[PDB]
Design a protein around this ligand. Sequence first.
Ligand SMILES: [Mg+2]
Lengths: 137, 137, 137, 137, 70, 70, 61, 61
Amino acid sequence: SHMIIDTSALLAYFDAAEPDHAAVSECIDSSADALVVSPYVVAELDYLVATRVGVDAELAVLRELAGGAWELANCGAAEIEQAARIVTKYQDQRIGIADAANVVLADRYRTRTILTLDRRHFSALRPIGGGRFTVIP
Amino acid sequence: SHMIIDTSALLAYFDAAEPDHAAVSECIDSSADALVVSPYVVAELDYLVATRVGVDAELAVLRELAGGAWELANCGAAEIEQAARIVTKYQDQRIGIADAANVVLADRYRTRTILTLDRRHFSALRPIGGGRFTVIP
Amino acid sequence: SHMIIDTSALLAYFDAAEPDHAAVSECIDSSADALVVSPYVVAELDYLVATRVGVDAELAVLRELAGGAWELANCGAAEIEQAARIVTKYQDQRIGIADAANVVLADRYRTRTILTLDRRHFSALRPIGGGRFTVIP
Amino acid sequence: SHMIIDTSALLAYFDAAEPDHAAVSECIDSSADALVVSPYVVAELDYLVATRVGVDAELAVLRELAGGAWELANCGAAEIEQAARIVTKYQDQRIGIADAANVVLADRYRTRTILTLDRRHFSALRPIGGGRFTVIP
Amino acid sequence: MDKTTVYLPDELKAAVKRAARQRGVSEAQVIRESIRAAVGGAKPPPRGGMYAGSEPIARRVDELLAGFGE
Amino acid sequence: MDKTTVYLPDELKAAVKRAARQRGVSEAQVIRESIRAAVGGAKPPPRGGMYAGSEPIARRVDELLAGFGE
Amino acid sequence: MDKTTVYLPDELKAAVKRAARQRGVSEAQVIRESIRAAVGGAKPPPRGGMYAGSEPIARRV
Amino acid sequence: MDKTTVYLPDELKAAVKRAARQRGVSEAQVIRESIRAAVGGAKPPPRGGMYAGSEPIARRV
Ligand SMILES: [Mg+2]
């Protein structure tokens, strides 16, 4: 019922020209899981699309995100505290708050399913409830 | 009173070696009311501290933000949509979702006070409700 | 006031050929307040109408009970606890959950008014907060 | 996440001397599932225990049911109306409100898991959402 | 007219807003209509006398409950 | 944050109170579920393929997040 | 009855309002889940075999 | 100043009174303490100067 979405996958999904666009499209469209996007990922996506593509696309992306199809997650005090613990656990890997927060949100939404193209990076991380993350595609 | 806080100000506040530390600290330590930090600003701050200082500093910052002193603002679809309209209104300015969301937050918390070091790259914009921003320090 | 309704009464109200139909009907119509029916009473009534009349009458009764005219009472843990207390108090009489629960519901709805055709059965019982029950018709 | 519990199973569970006691106990004890009980089942159970064992047993049963280990379901207007419709679809069997409501509640708590000793009776019934019920003992 | 205050999560308020602009009416009206649709209006009076039985069972409850719960 | 004001006619207020009392839930909750049942389940599908990129960045995120703000 | 009243010092209600305003939920569910988080584990386990009945009634099958 | 009236569903006041029983206290008190455990108390003042960096960044060009 839930899928956590990294910046990479959204870059691939919103851009037809990206090599991975199709593979990601088939995962998102025909999901039935709710689509979870961290605000940290929104930040990253905003910056990246803006600088590498330009403002028109930035606007397109923001408006789609606010369009209602997406679950826009909240990261509050508890979430940042726990995220900090996850960064701490992995600190040598310098994984950053986007990834950390995605781990946390994976537990919040009771899902092990992660949508990202950085597979090897995320596969070294472990779910808070134990087990293994499921990375798609 | 309430104050919207920008990445630069927080960079100055958390780092005692920064030339602006004293001024910004004077502004923040002396407030009686909400210190408002968007998650987008958190993302930016996280990245800058992690890459330019170290993961130890990054962790200190994350733990303090989760410490209960800060107003970590809820930014949902509405705020994103509105931020997008604020970004349309200015690309004269290449603002981005951080700054846009900061305007939106300024009126959600019904305050024109902005804490930040980029003075009239910020003051080149205008509050939603009318008037001009008070840009401190 | 609100009135607590017993299986017998509903049997007489829903069946036009029941000898007590007219009196019961006079009590129910003209009420103006909550007509309180326990789920236990619903179970009993379902069993009895299905068994002794037919499935079509059973279904008629169920749809009527669902039609919005009736106060279908919430019976949770607290209500079963108090009901057990009532059953204990009257232990020698073997009164059962429906009756005990009707006592409790009488207390919940702040009424001593009981609608039943077994008069002698509930006349023996006492309201939780003192006084006597008013058994009609 | 949830388990809908029939009268028969509860009879076997509260009675140490019932031949199916052990099986049901292994299902209940050691389950993560919330244990869902309709008030109609409570009525049936109450009557059967009171009449075929005794009032002290009835009391033990009611006090345990009220203890907090169990999820005691509401059946309101919507539940009764839907359950009537289910009585009708299953004209083949003759089921009544306890069984019909168990189907409804299975859908309300979105679980296909039914705890009952009436196997043949209940396998003919189908869940509202499609598929088949999973009948444990 | 009682003044009621409810928390509506952003999800639901956006849903309502959507429905409102699609129907061309106030958000208030959408909300009122939704509520009325769910809980109804003034409480409908009860209806008795839905059938005519063969035998009076109403005073016989205890006796006829015999096989209850199978 | 800011809670939504809802003006209920007394008929409807009584109905909400009634439903809540029967269901063992809050009046607020009855209202929310009314609204959800009316306007929910309708949420729009996601739109992909939104634009034409040129330079592919999706597998390069770390590398290209460099100047992240600002 | 349905709805509860309980004593909350000003500072506490302020804290509740803060939390709710930040996380984007009702004060009521801030308070509620606070309660659930404190009392969460303490749910009593179910208990069977309260008696041994003198008759075998549980199965028709 | 206390009017706080908050709906607590019928499962968790079970939890609460059980709780006050096992702790021997007011259940209103179990409630206040739970809340304070989650969100609680006067707002903590912020803390700055958590480190000293090796070169200024916060200000632009
Ligand atoms: Mg049955």
